[PDB]
Structure formats: C-alpha cells, structure tokens
mmCIF file of C-alpha atoms and ligand atoms in Angstrom:
data_model
loop_
_atom_site.group_PDB
_atom_site.id
_atom_site.type_symbol
_atom_site.label_atom_id
_atom_site.label_comp_id
_atom_site.label_asym_id
_atom_site.label_seq_id
_atom_site.Cartn_x
_atom_site.Cartn_y
_atom_site.Cartn_z
ATOM 1 C CA UNK A 241 120.565 72.776 89.750
ATOM 2 C CA UNK A 242 117.809 74.898 88.372
ATOM 3 C CA UNK A 243 119.766 76.090 84.960
ATOM 4 C CA UNK A 244 116.670 77.840 83.998
ATOM 5 C CA UNK A 245 116.338 80.269 87.187
ATOM 6 C CA UNK A 246 112.487 79.457 87.798
ATOM 7 C CA UNK A 247 110.720 79.676 90.834
ATOM 8 C CA UNK A 248 110.602 76.085 92.630
ATOM 9 C CA UNK A 249 107.728 74.869 94.753
ATOM 10 C CA UNK A 250 108.621 72.339 97.484
ATOM 11 C CA UNK A 251 105.995 70.184 99.282
ATOM 12 C CA UNK A 252 108.296 69.076 102.922
ATOM 13 C CA UNK A 253 107.008 66.179 104.794
ATOM 14 C CA UNK A 254 106.363 67.053 108.707
ATOM 15 C CA UNK A 255 110.048 65.450 109.145
ATOM 16 C CA UNK A 256 111.763 67.534 106.936
ATOM 17 C CA UNK A 257 109.607 70.976 107.756
ATOM 18 C CA UNK A 258 110.440 70.486 111.593
ATOM 19 C CA UNK A 259 114.388 72.206 110.681
ATOM 20 C CA UNK A 260 113.827 75.517 108.994
ATOM 21 C CA UNK A 261 117.291 76.444 107.985
ATOM 22 C CA UNK A 262 118.142 73.050 107.419
ATOM 23 C CA UNK A 263 115.222 72.929 104.745
ATOM 24 C CA UNK A 264 116.460 76.417 103.702
ATOM 25 C CA UNK A 265 119.948 74.688 103.171
ATOM 26 C CA UNK A 266 117.998 72.049 101.289
ATOM 27 C CA UNK A 267 115.872 74.180 99.043
ATOM 28 C CA UNK A 268 119.529 75.867 98.054
ATOM 29 C CA UNK A 269 121.341 72.368 97.356
ATOM 30 C CA UNK A 270 118.101 71.911 94.668
ATOM 31 C CA UNK A 271 119.012 75.429 93.344
ATOM 32 C CA UNK A 272 115.998 77.259 94.294
ATOM 33 C CA UNK A 273 117.689 80.280 95.489
ATOM 34 C CA UNK A 274 118.488 80.940 91.318
ATOM 35 C CA UNK A 275 114.938 82.260 91.057
ATOM 36 C CA UNK A 276 115.426 84.715 93.686
ATOM 37 C CA UNK A 277 112.064 83.269 94.904
ATOM 38 C CA UNK A 278 110.523 79.777 96.091
ATOM 39 C CA UNK A 279 107.258 78.443 97.348
ATOM 40 C CA UNK A 280 106.965 76.322 100.128
ATOM 41 C CA UNK A 281 104.044 74.407 100.784
ATOM 42 C CA UNK A 282 103.559 73.123 104.212
ATOM 43 C CA UNK A 283 102.581 69.640 105.611
ATOM 44 C CA UNK A 284 98.345 69.805 105.558
ATOM 45 C CA UNK A 285 98.321 68.780 109.300
ATOM 46 C CA UNK A 286 100.509 72.021 109.944
ATOM 47 C CA UNK A 287 98.639 74.987 111.355
ATOM 48 C CA UNK A 288 100.537 78.137 113.133
ATOM 49 C CA UNK A 289 96.867 79.396 114.815
ATOM 50 C CA UNK A 290 93.545 77.315 115.481
ATOM 51 C CA UNK A 291 91.521 80.365 114.310
ATOM 52 C CA UNK A 292 91.338 83.756 112.869
ATOM 53 C CA UNK A 293 88.152 85.036 114.357
ATOM 54 C CA UNK A 294 89.188 87.057 117.105
ATOM 55 C CA UNK A 295 91.603 89.684 115.298
ATOM 56 C CA UNK A 296 88.475 92.052 114.609
ATOM 57 C CA UNK A 297 90.059 94.576 117.332
ATOM 58 C CA UNK A 298 93.766 94.193 116.344
ATOM 59 C CA UNK A 299 94.936 97.994 115.398
ATOM 60 C CA UNK A 300 96.454 98.667 111.956
ATOM 61 C CA UNK A 301 98.770 101.579 113.288
ATOM 62 C CA UNK A 302 99.526 103.200 110.083
ATOM 63 C CA UNK A 303 97.538 102.061 107.219
ATOM 64 C CA UNK A 304 98.753 103.659 103.670
ATOM 65 C CA UNK A 305 96.727 104.851 101.034
ATOM 66 C CA UNK A 306 98.501 103.889 97.655
ATOM 67 C CA UNK A 307 98.990 106.376 94.909
ATOM 68 C CA UNK A 308 100.187 105.081 91.602
ATOM 69 C CA UNK A 309 101.467 107.508 88.922
ATOM 70 C CA UNK A 310 102.637 106.207 85.289
ATOM 71 C CA UNK A 311 101.964 105.127 82.167
ATOM 72 C CA UNK A 312 103.181 102.675 79.443
ATOM 73 C CA UNK A 313 104.200 99.784 82.144
ATOM 74 C CA UNK A 314 106.045 102.095 84.120
ATOM 75 C CA UNK A 315 104.943 103.715 87.305
ATOM 76 C CA UNK A 316 105.615 105.622 91.080
ATOM 77 C CA UNK A 317 103.830 104.612 94.128
ATOM 78 C CA UNK A 318 103.226 107.323 96.733
ATOM 79 C CA UNK A 319 102.054 106.427 100.105
ATOM 80 C CA UNK A 320 99.508 108.406 102.319
ATOM 81 C CA UNK A 321 99.459 107.534 105.812
ATOM 82 C CA UNK A 322 95.982 107.282 107.187
ATOM 83 C CA UNK A 323 94.929 107.200 110.624
ATOM 84 C CA UNK A 324 95.058 104.018 112.585
ATOM 85 C CA UNK A 325 91.940 101.561 111.773
ATOM 86 C CA UNK A 326 90.823 98.001 113.001
ATOM 87 C CA UNK A 327 91.066 94.644 110.904
ATOM 88 C CA UNK A 328 86.980 95.094 111.002
ATOM 89 C CA UNK A 329 87.427 98.542 109.430
ATOM 90 C CA UNK A 330 89.944 97.343 107.002
ATOM 91 C CA UNK A 331 87.900 94.414 105.969
ATOM 92 C CA UNK A 332 84.421 96.012 105.930
ATOM 93 C CA UNK A 333 86.398 98.377 103.486
ATOM 94 C CA UNK A 334 88.107 95.754 101.331
ATOM 95 C CA UNK A 335 85.194 93.853 100.615
ATOM 96 C CA UNK A 336 83.126 96.931 99.972
ATOM 97 C CA UNK A 337 81.873 97.504 96.398
ATOM 98 C CA UNK A 338 83.856 100.441 96.080
ATOM 99 C CA UNK A 339 87.504 98.096 96.487
ATOM 100 C CA UNK A 340 86.475 94.526 96.273
ATOM 101 C CA UNK A 341 88.186 92.153 93.510
ATOM 102 C CA UNK A 342 86.887 92.317 89.936
ATOM 103 C CA UNK A 343 85.074 89.243 88.215
ATOM 104 C CA UNK A 344 87.562 87.247 86.592
ATOM 105 C CA UNK A 345 87.987 83.671 85.168
ATOM 106 C CA UNK A 346 91.731 82.746 85.022
ATOM 107 C CA UNK A 347 94.818 84.568 86.706
ATOM 108 C CA UNK A 348 96.014 86.149 83.066
ATOM 109 C CA UNK A 349 92.571 87.990 83.037
ATOM 110 C CA UNK A 350 93.040 89.264 86.739
ATOM 111 C CA UNK A 351 96.812 90.308 86.288
ATOM 112 C CA UNK A 352 95.568 92.326 83.164
ATOM 113 C CA UNK A 353 92.967 94.058 85.375
ATOM 114 C CA UNK A 354 95.707 95.027 87.584
ATOM 115 C CA UNK A 355 98.161 96.794 84.874
ATOM 116 C CA UNK A 356 95.234 98.455 83.382
ATOM 117 C CA UNK A 357 93.780 99.936 86.702
ATOM 118 C CA UNK A 358 96.516 100.230 89.378
ATOM 119 C CA UNK A 359 96.710 104.193 88.678
ATOM 120 C CA UNK A 360 92.842 104.393 89.428
ATOM 121 C CA UNK A 361 90.693 104.572 93.094
ATOM 122 C CA UNK A 362 93.648 104.306 94.828
ATOM 123 C CA UNK A 363 93.607 101.127 97.553
ATOM 124 C CA UNK A 364 94.640 100.989 101.364
ATOM 125 C CA UNK A 365 97.177 98.679 102.460
ATOM 126 C CA UNK A 366 97.182 97.597 106.214
ATOM 127 C CA UNK A 367 100.950 97.144 105.861
ATOM 128 C CA UNK A 368 104.078 96.912 108.272
ATOM 129 C CA UNK A 369 101.936 95.791 111.467
ATOM 130 C CA UNK A 370 104.489 94.766 114.389
ATOM 131 C CA UNK A 371 102.830 91.776 115.205
ATOM 132 C CA UNK A 372 102.560 88.022 114.701
ATOM 133 C CA UNK A 373 99.419 85.344 114.021
ATOM 134 C CA UNK A 374 101.352 82.351 115.541
ATOM 135 C CA UNK A 375 100.818 80.742 118.637
ATOM 136 C CA UNK A 376 102.663 80.509 121.265
ATOM 137 C CA UNK A 377 103.362 76.646 121.369
ATOM 138 C CA UNK A 378 104.158 76.525 117.404
ATOM 139 C CA UNK A 379 107.666 75.163 116.983
ATOM 140 C CA UNK A 380 108.026 74.920 113.278
ATOM 141 C CA UNK A 381 108.766 77.817 110.581
ATOM 142 C CA UNK A 382 107.510 80.360 113.497
ATOM 143 C CA UNK A 383 108.251 83.625 111.754
ATOM 144 C CA UNK A 384 108.490 85.459 115.533
ATOM 145 C CA UNK A 385 111.521 83.356 116.241
ATOM 146 C CA UNK A 386 113.378 81.679 113.424
ATOM 147 C CA UNK A 387 116.577 81.245 115.135
ATOM 148 C CA UNK A 388 118.795 81.871 111.916
ATOM 149 C CA UNK A 389 122.514 83.377 112.174
ATOM 150 C CA UNK A 390 120.515 86.692 111.980
ATOM 151 C CA UNK A 391 120.192 86.831 115.959
ATOM 152 C CA UNK A 392 123.506 87.370 116.163
ATOM 153 C CA UNK A 393 122.993 91.327 115.724
ATOM 154 C CA UNK A 394 113.449 96.056 113.520
ATOM 155 C CA UNK A 395 115.271 93.746 111.064
ATOM 156 C CA UNK A 396 114.446 90.129 113.185
ATOM 157 C CA UNK A 397 110.628 91.266 114.388
ATOM 158 C CA UNK A 398 107.768 89.919 112.428
ATOM 159 C CA UNK A 399 105.257 92.004 110.552
ATOM 160 C CA UNK A 400 101.603 92.107 109.406
ATOM 161 C CA UNK A 401 100.064 92.676 105.939
ATOM 162 C CA UNK A 402 96.467 93.457 105.637
ATOM 163 C CA UNK A 403 95.930 93.648 101.841
ATOM 164 C CA UNK A 404 93.127 94.358 99.381
ATOM 165 C CA UNK A 405 92.490 94.431 95.831
ATOM 166 C CA UNK A 406 94.934 96.081 93.758
ATOM 167 C CA UNK A 407 97.444 96.834 96.876
ATOM 168 C CA UNK A 408 101.312 96.535 95.877
ATOM 169 C CA UNK A 409 104.630 95.901 96.863
ATOM 170 C CA UNK A 410 107.332 97.377 94.373
ATOM 171 C CA UNK A 411 110.248 96.339 93.111
ATOM 172 C CA UNK A 412 113.013 95.661 95.546
ATOM 173 C CA UNK A 413 115.470 93.528 97.417
ATOM 174 C CA UNK A 414 115.792 92.638 101.362
ATOM 175 C CA UNK A 415 116.916 95.189 103.600
ATOM 176 C CA UNK A 416 120.581 94.701 103.370
ATOM 177 C CA UNK A 417 120.014 91.761 100.983
ATOM 178 C CA UNK A 418 118.802 89.295 103.246
ATOM 179 C CA UNK A 419 115.916 86.325 102.796
ATOM 180 C CA UNK A 420 112.808 86.698 103.650
ATOM 181 C CA UNK A 421 109.612 84.714 105.002
ATOM 182 C CA UNK A 422 106.318 85.403 104.052
ATOM 183 C CA UNK A 423 103.482 83.209 105.119
ATOM 184 C CA UNK A 424 99.674 83.792 103.899
ATOM 185 C CA UNK A 425 98.134 83.417 106.853
ATOM 186 C CA UNK A 426 94.464 83.856 105.104
ATOM 187 C CA UNK A 427 92.419 85.288 102.714
ATOM 188 C CA UNK A 428 92.804 85.991 98.758
ATOM 189 C CA UNK A 429 96.072 85.446 97.258
ATOM 190 C CA UNK A 430 99.211 87.275 96.545
ATOM 191 C CA UNK A 431 100.752 87.363 93.231
ATOM 192 C CA UNK A 432 104.619 87.668 92.737
ATOM 193 C CA UNK A 433 107.038 88.641 90.297
ATOM 194 C CA UNK A 434 110.727 87.863 90.546
ATOM 195 C CA UNK A 435 114.120 88.878 88.852
ATOM 196 C CA UNK A 436 117.165 85.921 89.280
ATOM 197 C CA UNK A 437 119.869 87.629 91.574
ATOM 198 C CA UNK A 438 122.352 87.048 88.788
ATOM 199 C CA UNK A 439 120.292 89.642 86.459
ATOM 200 C CA UNK A 440 119.460 92.025 89.340
ATOM 201 C CA UNK A 441 122.008 94.214 88.056
ATOM 202 C CA UNK A 442 120.108 94.636 84.742
ATOM 203 C CA UNK A 443 117.043 95.482 86.289
ATOM 204 C CA UNK A 444 118.862 98.554 88.275
ATOM 205 C CA UNK A 445 120.150 99.240 84.820
ATOM 206 C CA UNK A 446 116.752 99.685 83.189
ATOM 207 C CA UNK A 447 115.072 101.381 86.433
ATOM 208 C CA UNK A 448 118.353 103.902 86.457
ATOM 209 C CA UNK A 449 117.466 104.500 82.598
ATOM 210 C CA UNK A 450 113.792 105.168 83.348
ATOM 211 C CA UNK A 451 114.046 107.231 86.408
ATOM 212 C CA UNK A 452 117.369 109.095 86.358
ATOM 213 C CA UNK A 453 116.739 112.131 88.736
ATOM 214 C CA UNK A 454 115.881 109.264 91.343
ATOM 215 C CA UNK A 455 119.105 107.396 90.606
ATOM 216 C CA UNK A 456 120.951 110.595 90.720
ATOM 217 C CA UNK A 457 119.404 111.650 94.208
ATOM 218 C CA UNK A 458 120.091 108.036 95.663
ATOM 219 C CA UNK A 459 122.165 105.370 94.439
ATOM 220 C CA UNK A 460 120.195 102.625 95.493
ATOM 221 C CA UNK A 461 116.460 104.234 94.925
ATOM 222 C CA UNK A 462 114.429 100.876 94.267
ATOM 223 C CA UNK A 463 115.207 100.491 98.214
ATOM 224 C CA UNK A 464 112.748 103.648 98.522
ATOM 225 C CA UNK A 465 109.866 100.666 97.455
ATOM 226 C CA UNK A 466 108.096 103.233 94.992
ATOM 227 C CA UNK A 467 108.892 101.901 91.515
ATOM 228 C CA UNK A 468 106.487 99.456 89.712
ATOM 229 C CA UNK A 469 107.459 97.503 86.713
ATOM 230 C CA UNK A 470 104.566 95.644 84.170
ATOM 231 C CA UNK A 471 105.872 91.980 83.411
ATOM 232 C CA UNK A 472 105.552 93.747 79.336
ATOM 233 C CA UNK A 473 108.055 96.373 80.028
ATOM 234 C CA UNK A 474 110.364 93.869 81.463
ATOM 235 C CA UNK A 475 109.612 91.451 78.327
ATOM 236 C CA UNK A 476 110.172 94.720 76.377
ATOM 237 C CA UNK A 477 113.589 94.850 77.612
ATOM 238 C CA UNK A 478 114.753 91.868 77.770
ATOM 239 C CA UNK A 479 115.096 91.409 81.494
ATOM 240 C CA UNK A 480 114.481 87.789 82.903
ATOM 241 C CA UNK A 481 111.576 86.947 85.202
ATOM 242 C CA UNK A 482 109.284 84.560 86.468
ATOM 243 C CA UNK A 483 106.041 84.950 88.294
ATOM 244 C CA UNK A 484 104.113 82.619 90.806
ATOM 245 C CA UNK A 485 100.907 83.259 92.844
ATOM 246 C CA UNK A 486 101.035 82.094 96.496
ATOM 247 C CA UNK A 487 97.444 80.962 98.071
ATOM 248 C CA UNK A 488 96.204 81.147 101.766
ATOM 249 C CA UNK A 489 98.420 78.988 104.080
ATOM 250 C CA UNK A 490 101.685 78.562 101.755
ATOM 251 C CA UNK A 491 105.423 80.279 102.638
ATOM 252 C CA UNK A 492 107.319 82.357 99.848
ATOM 253 C CA UNK A 493 111.083 82.391 100.312
ATOM 254 C CA UNK A 494 113.151 85.536 99.064
ATOM 255 C CA UNK A 495 116.811 84.750 98.637
ATOM 256 C CA UNK A 496 119.668 87.226 98.853
ATOM 257 C CA UNK A 497 119.406 89.811 96.008
ATOM 258 C CA UNK A 498 116.558 88.515 94.571
ATOM 259 C CA UNK A 499 114.494 91.327 93.387
ATOM 260 C CA UNK A 500 110.398 90.564 93.513
ATOM 261 C CA UNK A 501 107.072 92.693 93.584
ATOM 262 C CA UNK A 502 103.674 91.598 93.169
ATOM 263 C CA UNK A 503 99.669 92.784 94.207
ATOM 264 C CA UNK A 504 97.072 91.205 96.244
ATOM 265 C CA UNK A 505 94.088 89.762 95.033
ATOM 266 C CA UNK A 506 91.843 90.921 97.560
ATOM 267 C CA UNK A 507 91.327 90.986 101.461
ATOM 268 C CA UNK A 508 94.018 89.139 102.800
ATOM 269 C CA UNK A 509 96.611 88.468 105.794
ATOM 270 C CA UNK A 510 100.558 88.024 105.053
ATOM 271 C CA UNK A 511 103.141 87.435 108.038
ATOM 272 C CA UNK A 512 106.952 88.290 107.131
ATOM 273 C CA UNK A 513 110.653 88.588 108.739
ATOM 274 C CA UNK A 514 114.118 88.615 107.189
ATOM 275 C CA UNK A 515 115.947 86.088 108.342
ATOM 276 C CA UNK A 516 119.899 84.763 107.195
ATOM 277 C CA UNK A 517 122.285 81.989 106.356
ATOM 278 C CA UNK A 518 126.140 81.785 106.445
ATOM 279 C CA UNK A 519 125.594 82.493 102.433
ATOM 280 C CA UNK A 520 124.147 86.230 103.100
ATOM 281 C CA UNK A 521 127.511 87.301 105.152
ATOM 282 C CA UNK A 522 128.961 88.252 101.610
ATOM 283 C CA UNK A 523 125.689 89.930 100.391
ATOM 284 C CA UNK A 524 125.497 91.824 103.591
ATOM 285 C CA UNK A 525 129.032 93.134 103.177
ATOM 286 C CA UNK A 526 128.564 94.172 99.462
ATOM 287 C CA UNK A 527 125.244 95.365 100.297
ATOM 288 C CA UNK A 528 124.185 99.091 98.294
ATOM 289 C CA UNK A 529 122.267 100.894 100.597
ATOM 290 C CA UNK A 530 119.843 104.106 100.177
ATOM 291 C CA UNK A 531 121.797 107.284 101.007
ATOM 292 C CA UNK A 532 118.341 109.162 102.089
ATOM 293 C CA UNK A 533 117.495 103.100 105.802
ATOM 294 C CA UNK A 534 117.830 99.851 107.775
ATOM 295 C CA UNK A 535 121.998 99.130 108.261
ATOM 296 C CA UNK A 536 123.432 96.558 109.927
ATOM 297 C CA UNK A 537 127.115 96.404 111.170
ATOM 298 C CA UNK A 538 128.532 93.078 109.642
ATOM 299 C CA UNK A 539 131.882 93.224 112.029
ATOM 300 C CA UNK A 540 130.106 90.823 114.039
ATOM 301 C CA UNK A 541 129.475 88.154 111.371
ATOM 302 C CA UNK A 542 132.933 88.490 109.851
ATOM 303 C CA UNK A 543 134.642 88.254 112.803
ATOM 304 C CA UNK A 544 132.518 84.661 113.655
ATOM 305 C CA UNK A 545 132.392 82.908 110.242
ATOM 306 C CA UNK A 546 135.180 84.843 108.182
ATOM 307 C CA UNK A 547 137.639 85.326 111.392
ATOM 308 C CA UNK A 548 140.605 84.739 108.325
ATOM 309 C CA UNK A 549 139.283 87.410 106.100
ATOM 310 C CA UNK A 550 138.470 90.008 108.968
ATOM 311 C CA UNK A 551 141.932 91.803 108.987
ATOM 312 C CA UNK A 552 141.461 91.934 104.617
ATOM 313 C CA UNK A 553 137.954 93.297 104.908
ATOM 314 C CA UNK A 554 138.750 95.874 107.834
ATOM 315 C CA UNK A 555 141.292 97.314 105.399
ATOM 316 C CA UNK A 556 139.494 97.264 102.143
ATOM 317 C CA UNK A 557 141.758 94.380 100.301
ATOM 318 C CA UNK A 558 138.780 91.586 100.538
ATOM 319 C CA UNK A 559 136.932 92.273 97.001
ATOM 320 C CA UNK A 560 135.407 88.581 96.454
ATOM 321 C CA UNK A 561 132.878 88.283 93.574
ATOM 322 C CA UNK A 562 129.761 86.808 94.559
ATOM 323 C CA UNK A 563 128.634 83.804 92.700
ATOM 324 C CA UNK A 564 124.956 83.865 92.368
ATOM 325 C CA UNK A 565 124.294 80.270 91.167
ATOM 326 C CA UNK A 566 126.269 78.766 94.489
ATOM 327 C CA UNK A 567 124.726 77.149 97.431
ATOM 328 C CA UNK A 568 124.550 77.537 101.138
ATOM 329 C CA UNK A 569 127.672 76.116 102.586
ATOM 330 C CA UNK A 570 124.905 74.611 105.059
ATOM 331 C CA UNK A 571 123.530 72.684 101.835
ATOM 332 C CA UNK A 572 126.254 70.265 101.984
ATOM 333 C CA UNK A 573 124.538 67.424 103.727
ATOM 334 C CA UNK A 574 122.399 67.549 100.359
ATOM 335 C CA UNK A 575 125.514 67.392 97.537
HETATM 336 C C1 FQE B 883 110.144 98.377 108.610
HETATM 337 C C2 FQE B 883 109.698 98.779 107.096
HETATM 338 C C3 FQE B 883 109.495 97.722 106.622
HETATM 339 N N1 FQE B 883 110.261 96.766 106.552
HETATM 340 C C4 FQE B 883 109.751 96.080 105.279
HETATM 341 C C5 FQE B 883 109.961 96.236 104.091
HETATM 342 C C6 FQE B 883 109.813 95.155 102.927
HETATM 343 C C7 FQE B 883 110.610 94.100 102.465
HETATM 344 N N2 FQE B 883 109.980 93.359 101.706
HETATM 345 N N3 FQE B 883 108.603 93.682 101.608
HETATM 346 C C8 FQE B 883 107.721 93.071 100.692
HETATM 347 N N4 FQE B 883 108.200 91.754 100.177
HETATM 348 C C9 FQE B 883 107.718 91.201 99.869
HETATM 349 C C10 FQE B 883 105.833 91.113 99.648
HETATM 350 C C11 FQE B 883 105.675 92.073 100.437
HETATM 351 C C12 FQE B 883 104.088 92.181 100.411
HETATM 352 O O1 FQE B 883 103.495 91.443 100.323
HETATM 353 N N5 FQE B 883 103.780 93.495 101.334
HETATM 354 C C13 FQE B 883 104.453 94.048 101.603
HETATM 355 N N6 FQE B 883 105.864 94.329 101.553
HETATM 356 C C14 FQE B 883 106.574 93.160 101.112
HETATM 357 C C15 FQE B 883 108.653 94.841 102.507
HETATM 358 C C16 FQE B 883 110.251 96.624 107.451
HETATM 359 C C17 FQE B 883 110.870 97.572 108.946
HETATM 360 ZN ZN1 ZN B 884 110.416 91.918 99.980
HETATM 361 ZN ZN1 ZN B 885 117.997 106.806 99.300
#
C-alpha cells in the first residue's frame, strides 16, 4: 500500500474511467493518496473538446506578472495584476523571443534553468480564469460538474490557467485541505513537486524557520501561495518529496493535505477545481486556515456523515487524530 509514498500513475480503461468518485476510491485503495499527488492518464479514445482553435478571443480578466525574490533555494513570489488580455495576446507573448522556453535536452536541464532563472525576466501567468474548456455532452471527469459530496455546500467552480515558461505555483495545500483535479488541455508540460501528507508538518516547520516574520503575522502563511522552495533545499533539510511532469491530455489529482508546487514549461492551458470524498470531512474540520480566505462551514458535512459525532464536535470534545495512510471509506469495494 505505497510504503514509499511515491507519485503513482494510473491508466484506466473507458469502463473504469466513467465513474469519477469510484476511480478516486480505487486509486486510494492502491495507496496513491500517500504521495499527496497522483497522475491519471485517460483512455486514448477520450477527449473533453473536439478542438482548441475557437478560444483566441477568450478573455483572461486578471493576468498576473510574477516577480520572484530570493536566493539559495528560498524565494517569495509577488503577483502584479495586469489588465485583461486575450488568449491570442497571451500566446503571442508566451511564444515571443523574450518569454519562449529555452533549448533543452532532458527535463533535469530545464529544471536547473528554472531554478537558476526564476528571479529574472518576470513572466505573465493567465491564472484563475473562471471557465471551462469541456464541451456540454462530456459526462466523464467533467471538472465543471464532478458531482462529489462537495456539492452539499467559488469552491465547486472550474478555473482555467494559461501558462508560459517559468510561470509558477508556490508551495500549498488546497483551501480547506480539499482534493483537486488538474487537466492539461493542451500545450507544453507542467512539472510538479509534492510532499506526502504524512510529512506536511515537516515542510510547514521548515518554512516557519525560514520566513519567521511571515509565520508570526499569519498561522498558515503558505496558504498565501507565495513561497517557493527548491528540490535541493528540501533535500538539504531532509524533507521527503517526489517530482512528476504532467503532459497534455493528462490529469493530476492532489489529495487532502498534500503540499504541491511547480512550474510550466511553456504555453499551455490547464483546467482545475476542488472536490471531496468522505475521507476529507475530517481534514475540513481540522484544517488550519489563513488569518488575514476560502472558508467552508463543516456543520452540514458532520450532520450527514458523522451524525453521532456532531454533538461531541459542536462542543469541542471531538479530537480524532487523522491517519494520512488510511484510504477513503468508499475504497471498501477495492480492498
Ligand atoms: C480563487 C483563488 C484561486 N483559487 C485556486 C488556488 C489554487 C489551488 N491550487 N492551485 C494550484 N494547484 C496546482 C496547480 C496549479 C497551477 O498549475 N497553477 C495555479 N494554481 C495551481 C491554485 C481558486 C479560488
Ligand atoms: Zn493546488
Ligand atoms: Zn493569512
């Protein structure tokens, strides 16, 4: 049951792939959740949209210029909101000489170039664009309507991310320690780093040691999604982690309390949203939030799935310690 907590890759058939929540339960029974990140390669015959040639006049309302400050594997990213631009304007800029991906042999070479140049030539990230690239009829893994227990509740809505070389997402867990689904619609790859949920507190303690002013101001400062930490720093301080490259037409699943970060190799488009399973309810209850934020009332969840614990929890007498290695109750039919 994944004792090494390494990122697992799944290749479901069309029949396996049809039920989203059932397949999430299956990958959990195989211990995929232990790494905090997993890859799901869909069947070759599956496509969420016939063509991506009609999106040139799609508006990115808040492009963000990403300014990075730091040294020795420790960085802070500052976002500068720019005025609205089209995918056409973004793609041209992305592919221009100033912002294009450098020439490289292996990923290790591109990764080294990223960590060496992330403070130079700030890129533009077409992030958090409300919308979907999923066609209407597509019933399998539709990020716009996954129909998880999360529907009981801008947390169940899809977001589009138009990336360019060196655009980054900082170290973070999902808001409310939820799950997330990320599908790379098209383009250049997206490379990820993950810290297993069982070592999430080790990363937080390391981050608190390096940014003590940021931690004294906010309890969960990593939730601001500004802190970038290189694989070499993680290695230097014995933080266990793994890395994976997501290619066009592949899904990435993030698990409750699974810390992740990464960067885009070049012009690309990803679709994302949050989702839940019965396992998340305890993570939602115990989630340490940003003081200075996305907040969900957990009462409705405890009232339906834990009616016996509702009174105890409403009082403060529910002090259940989470086991990060345990799979979702739904994973019963696969064990
Ligand atoms: C509103 C504010 C934004 N939030 C979304 C926050 C969130 C959470 N995770 N996350 C990311 N995780 C993984 C991958 C990526 C990525 O490739 N790119 C950007 N962001 C990523 C982003 C929605 C409400
Ligand atoms: Zn995320
Ligand atoms: Zn805060």
